[PDB]
């Protein structure tokens, strides 16, 4: 790196840097398979598996009200 | 014009436009079906979408496999208080990625601001970088510094299709490396005559980089970021400027390029840190000094513009405000010249100007007379 | 005036003021006690605070119930290495919400920037939206797009009272929907005569929306966000402007509304993306072209201002800088007219102006002469 | 959506958007009951329950040094 | 000059410079070795680095101790499906801190934006604050409000050395407390004569604080944040200004300090919230009113600049845009005077000016005549 | 707090605030010891301990490609 102080304008220029320029975007589409958790039911009251499964179902349902492009009119 | 104000927000809007436009193609049902087909026998597949763009396709199936092949067996007749809690701990592990992705997409309404480890693991990031349409050196640099690829990308929710969650990650392609860049810093240059002042300040500060014949000026703070010798810039955030623009660093008063300045009739004291030092604009009303982390205050500075090296000091202060210098090595050089501001008659100086070509300041003085 | 600079930061300050003022009411001890009373027999209650505002009250008690009714039994005489680890895994599940809330309030010193799933579950968000004081259509739209309600709200810590953690969530009420909005984009318009230039740029870009008789201008990027046809704006971020302001899109040179512009004596090349296309300001020194994701470069563009449709192209470039067009459908129309800038004599053009009424530019030329 | 390119000023206006305007705030006060975890003590050394409980106690204590309005002068 | 534009981004750049410079010292191998030595017999150690700065050193070893003393025993001959799952749950607890730190450093490419509970626990934050080089009162205030120390610090990755992860946390030292601060708010002041307008707006809004003989102006929104009576500011974000600058609040037309304004020939209606009330600039074309959370609309406001107290109202509105007033108590006082703008002849007013000394506006009028 | 409305300029000044000024930075260096998890191998297929350990190893490896100052040229 080389810095030059330009007395005529109270400024500095520093040279010697190397660019890393973003020139494009690459798209990596993901498909995350959750499996059929919506045919699964826990009838025997509070359970560790029940809460984990219910987290999964309610997360799955919430995700469909999310939209990055068009408004949902149901 | 104020170049910074023109360029502000452009790169972020362009990135979202780019990502949303591709998401529009992927969101069609016949596009989703083709994607599910291509991944029927593999976990990774390259493909071309209906609109002609080439993309990487990745399948994440651990949670489906655990649900189908382990959890469903264990829950015979809707009973879940089973005595094998391994089953319960396993589920909690196998769904964490999915649950985290849902939090991130719900919080941001479907467009994350960058790429968490749940959108894309370290392994998947490395594969995506290796498939990018660019040359080996660019890919090597991105692979070895992939946290920076991560930081500058983001994610978009395509939707939920059956039990399948479909999203896309936009990774930044750094397709040009190791062309020259440089940075201009500046502080107010003031001349005082009889207690009146004429001041100017360069308004072309920031990063410049060359690429394929042109020079691009990045006027804004968020457009570029350094790591050692390398500066990462988003091309969509810059303005192409004439090569003649480098003359503002050479003959700013003589040149015919329109070197942008602002002016004032009253001084501003401040510190502009530079990569290898600091500029200290020190005027009447304040005290400036330079210090050492070892031996305390070194010296008070004279009034006017002073350039301080990071080998001359560790700190510079204006009154009590401390600025720490960098510890980067490099050569410092002074290019002497009479300050342009001292060629002004404070009694004939114009009204305060914001972002005007410097020659219009001289024009203003002579057409007033 | 610079309208953008006036409006900047206003909506965020107003939102925090609104939330902090209510928090001041809730933080009194007799207010906290009334709230605890109202929730003694239910998990949800509507109430009116001492200052006259109506709020929703919600109680979250799972972790207290697990501590009182399960954990405390199992720890007889201060011994915790019990052989039932279900007890240990259960606790880790039952306290996660609480522990997450503490992280979020400690990191942000008591004011979160938005509403995590721990401050408010999906179920609680839906109930809060359904109780809002607005009409059914507004509530339906918010319910079906509640991630956007989430994004634009935030949370505030009231305090810890006994073992009870008290916080409030501010949810945005979108009380007006489906009134007309529109967006103005612009790029520099330059006329060259004898190698000198006269340039102007519209400075009224951004979103406009009508509501109850008035037009509001949103000059800043963070004030509005689109989702398809809908644009979410915060009313506190806008400036009310005369309906006559729409004349700047009609007769910008003739009208008596003060159409804001900036001017220059030197061209700026750049790309302003528009929802259905792009404006390309292409001047001496750069090369501009339009491209297709399918068939490569289509055509180089002539110098001057060119309008490109997203059906004419997929990309526009200035030198090597690529801008991706949108894929939104809609009708494009040209409204022909002589560019105002070409009615300027570059040899009689004023000094660079920032955000001035256009008629003051014409005034400047004739009073100089 | 309808976009008009205004040749006289190198600008575009796009119409046809529908507003969703934030006009007010609705307040949802929460009371999260933690329960009496501060009368609970683990005397028998390292335990899974001990660490979870200590997370809970130290989180509960940290939360009272947080303030969104007034400075704590204790 | 535009003071806000000069100061913008300075504090963030200075903070990163300060942190990166220290990280450069720590990253040497002989520096890392000295640090590992100092911590060989303790979990906390104070030390002085090779460059002369004094730092706190902390060792986090729980995950190493669990790996060496528990996990490794249990995995005899590379077999991990053991029947003691306590071992599996324990690991998941003991590695969470480490895994969280990795997420945070990978997402941000080695520089976190603030200090999570994983970079620094509540216990470690309290110890670090107690060791700071400042006086007892400053430390007491920081200790009792340490969430604010957290918010304004950040973290930097030094590297991985063996199995040891080395990072540094920069904590803000609030070394000056309880000196006087004050805040200026303003809204457009317009005078109309014959349907023409002369307008001005004070451009010196924001926070001012004294320290050790000087007054510092903080022109930008992110530079200061209040908590009750206290306002937290970063000194590196301010500009030192003459004490005479307080005259702009006293005799703005008479004084010889250069009171910065912007001007217009067309009115802007808007609301500037103040800590104890609001300024409402209400001009032709809009309707303004003040309201009560109890009894509805109180009163429509007259045209011109009106000052509203938070005891006079709970809301002020321009057309339909609602602004909620604060509920902070304090004394309100009117300092009467003829508005400066009403001493202007709208038919002799200059062109729109941005951030100029007010006396240059008067100069402009008389030199035009 | 005391607010004064300055009728001559449509402005207010509010006084009575007390400063809390950031004047310096204090540095707290951390050394987090992970232990020798890279000499640990699970040969007996899927296990809870195996996944937790693999999380730990892959997190440890990812961390060395992160750099806050100099570009990695390997
Ligand atoms: C301000 O400083 C710059 C940089 O030193 C000056 O630019 C230089 O001007 C000279 C004089 O015309 C150029 O020399 C000529 O170069 C051409 C190249 O084709 C050659 O045909 C001529 O015989 C002569 O050698 C020089 O190239 C040029 N440098 C650059 C980098 O462009 C500039 O003239 C100065 N401006 C003023 C107003 O003094
Ligand atoms: C710039 O263009 C605008 C838009 O076309 C012009 O506004 C229009 O001006 C005409 C002429 O006065 C108006 O027509 C009149 O309308 C009133 C309505 O009460 C009626 O009483 C008259 O007999 C006549 O028909 C028209 O309403 C108006 N349009 C709008 C939307 O306001 C404007 O005049 C142009 N400016 C210049 C300086 O040319
Ligand atoms: C605008 O208002 C300010 C504030 O009231 C005026 O400042 C005050 O000016 C008077 C007149 O010179 C000063 O009084 C003198 O103080 C010195 C102190 O050493 C003393 O030697 C003299 O005998 C006399 O008493 C006063 O100190 C000063 N106040 C402050 C706070 O500086 C200012 O003059 C006004 N400007 C105009 C142009 O009217
Ligand atoms: C299982 O779930 C699928 C998909 O939701 C549903 O169509 C089907 O009726 C269910 N049937 C059985 C036997 O589980
Ligand atoms: C799930 O079942 C398969 C056999 O179908 C077995 O190989 C695997 O280890 C099981 N995983 C868990 C976590 O129980
Ligand atoms: C807690 O105890 C209640 C009975 O008092 C029981 O119904 C419930 O299932 C228990 N929960 C756990 C997680 O042990
Ligand atoms: C339990 O905790 C309460 C509240 O902190 C305390 O007042 C009381 O002394 C404790 N007593 C018993 C019997 O646990
Ligand atoms: C680890 O082993 C030590 C004895 O070496 C024991 O004291 C400690 O409780 C054990 N911890 C776990 C979590 O097994
Ligand atoms: C253990 O790991 C160390 C450090 O990576 C390595 O040098 C050594 O060869 C290994 N040896 C044994 C016996 O585990």
Topology at a glance:
The complex is a heterohexamer, with 3 copies of chain A (74 residues) and 3 copies of chain B (369 residues).
Chain A: E1 2-6, E2 11-22, E3 24-33, H1 48-64
Antiparallel strand pairs in A: 1-2
Chain B: H1 3-7, H2 10-26, H3 29-38, E1 44-48, E2 54-60, H4 62-74, H5 86-94, H6 96-107, E3 111-112, H7 122-130, H8 136-144, H9 146-152, E4 154-161, E5 164-173, E6 176-186, E7 189-193, E8 196-202, E9 206-211, E10 214-218, E11 224-227, E12 230-234, E13 239-241, E14 260-264, E15 270-274, E16 277-282, E17 288-292, E18 296-300, E19 304-309, E20 315-318, E21 321-324, E22 331-335, E23 356-357, H10 358-368
Antiparallel strand pairs in B: 1-2, 3-4, 4-5, 6-9, 7-8, 8-14, 9-10, 10-13, 11-12, 14-23, 15-16, 16-19, 17-18, 17-20, 20-21
Write structural notes for this entry:
- The complex is a heterohexamer, with three copies of chain A (74 residues) and three copies of chain B (369 residues).
- By secondary structure, chain A is α+β, with helices and mostly antiparallel strands.
- Chain A has one domain (1-74).
- Chain A is 23% helix and 36% strand.
- Chain A has a two-stranded antiparallel ribbon.
- In chain A, 54% of the residues are buried.
- Chain B is α+β, with helices and mostly antiparallel strands.
- Chain B contains ten helices and 23 strands.
- In chain B, the strands form seven sheets. A four-stranded antiparallel β-sheet of chain B has the order 6-9-10-13. In chain B, strands 7-8-14-23 form a four-stranded antiparallel β-sheet.
- In chain B, strand 1 (44-48) and strand 2 (54-60) form a beta hairpin.
- In chain B, helix 8 crosses helix 9.
- Chains in contact: A-B, A-C, B-C, B-E, B-F, C-D, C-E, D-E, E-F.
- The interface between B and F is medium-sized, with 18 and 17 residues.
- One 2-acetamido-2-deoxy-beta-D-glucopyranose (NAG) binds at residues 69-70, 90 of chain E.
**Spatial gap, N to C terminus of chain A:** 60 Å
Number of distinct helices of chain A: 1
How much helical structure, as a percent, in the residues of chain A? 10-25%
User: Strand order across the biggest sheet of chain A?
Assistant: 1-2
Give Rg of chain B in angstroms.
29 Å
Order of helices and strands of chain A: EEEH
The overall strand count of chain B is 23
Shape of chain A: elongated
Tell me what portion of residues of chain B adopts beta-strand conformation. Answer: 25-35%
Report the biggest beta sheet of chain B as strand number plus sense, adding barrel if it closes. Answer: 4 strands, antiparallel
For the sheet with most strands of chain A, the description reads: 2 strands, antiparallel
- Tertiary shape of chain B: elongated
Instruction: Give helix % range of chain B.
Output: 25-40%
Structural class of chain B: alpha+beta
Return the domain count of chain B: 2
Q: What hetero molecules are in the model? A: a molecule of 3 linked components (NAG-NAG-BMA), 2-acetamido-2-deoxy-beta-D-glucopyranose
Q: Please report which band the strand proportion of chain A falls in: under 5%, 5-15%, 15-25%, 25-35%, 35-45% or over 45%.
A: 35-45%
Family (chains B, C, E): Belongs to the paramyxoviruses fusion glycoprotein family.
Membrane topology (chains B, C, E): Single-pass membrane protein; Single-pass type I membrane protein
Subcellular location (chains B, C, E): Host cell membrane; Virion membrane
Glycosylation sites (chains B, C, E): 70, 251
């Amino acid at each position: 790196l080389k810095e030059s102080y330009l007395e005529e304008s109270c400024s500095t220029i520093t040279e010697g840097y190397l660019s890393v320029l973003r020139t494009g975007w690459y798209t990596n589409v993901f498909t995350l398979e959750v499996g059929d958790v919506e045919n699964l039911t826990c009838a025997d009251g509070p359970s560790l598996i029940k809460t984990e499964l219910d987290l999964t179902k309610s997360a799955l349902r919430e995700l469909r009200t999310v939209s990055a492009d068009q408004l949902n009119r149901e | 014009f104020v170049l910074g104000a023109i360029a502000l927000g452009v790169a972020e809007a362009a990135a979202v436009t780019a990502g949303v436009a591709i998401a529009k193609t992927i969101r069609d049902e016949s596009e989703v079906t083709a994607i599910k087909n291509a991944l029927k026998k593999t976990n990774e597949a390259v493909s071309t979408l209906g609109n002609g763009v080439r993309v990487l396709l990745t399948a994440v199936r651990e949670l489906k496999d655990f649900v189908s092949k382990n959890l469903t067996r264990a829950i015979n007749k809707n009973k879940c208080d089973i005595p094998d809690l391994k089953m319960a701990v396993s589920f909690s592990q196998f769904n964490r990625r999915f649950l985290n992705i849902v939090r991130q997409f719900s919080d941001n309404a479907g467009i994350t601001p960058a790429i968490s480890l749940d959108l894309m693991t370290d392994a998947e990031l490395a594969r995506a970088v290796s498939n990018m349409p660019t040359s080996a050196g660019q890919i090597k640099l991105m692979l070895e510094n992939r946290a920076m690829v991560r930081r500058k990308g983001f994610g978009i929710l395509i939707g939920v299709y059956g039990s399948s969650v479909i999203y896309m990650v936009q990774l930044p392609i750094f397709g040009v490396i190791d062309t020259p860049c440089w940075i201009v810093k500046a502080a107010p240059s003031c001349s005082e005559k009889k207690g009146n002042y004429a001041c100017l300040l360069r308004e072309d500060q920031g990063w410049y980089c060359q690429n394929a014949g042109s020079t691009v000026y990045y006027p804004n703070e968020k457009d570029c970021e350094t790591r050692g010798d390398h500066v990462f810039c988003d091309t969509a955030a810059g303005i192409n400027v004439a090569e003649q623009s480098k003359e503002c660093n050479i003959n700013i008063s003589t040149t015919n390029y329109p070197c942008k300045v602002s002016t004032g009739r009253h001084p501003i004291s401040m510190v502009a840190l530079s990569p290898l030092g600091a500029l200290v604009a020190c005027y009447k009303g304040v005290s400036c000094s330079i210090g050492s982390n070892r031996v305390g205050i070194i010296k008070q500075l004279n009034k006017g513009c002073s350039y301080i090296t990071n080998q001359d000091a560790d700190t510079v202060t204006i009154d009590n405000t401390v600025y720490q210098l960098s510890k980067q090595e490099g050569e410092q050089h002074v290019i002497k010249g009479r300050p342009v501001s001292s060629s002004f008659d404070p009694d004939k100086f114009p009204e305060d100007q914001f972002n005007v070509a410097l020659d219009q300041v001289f024009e203003s003085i002579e057409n007033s007379q």
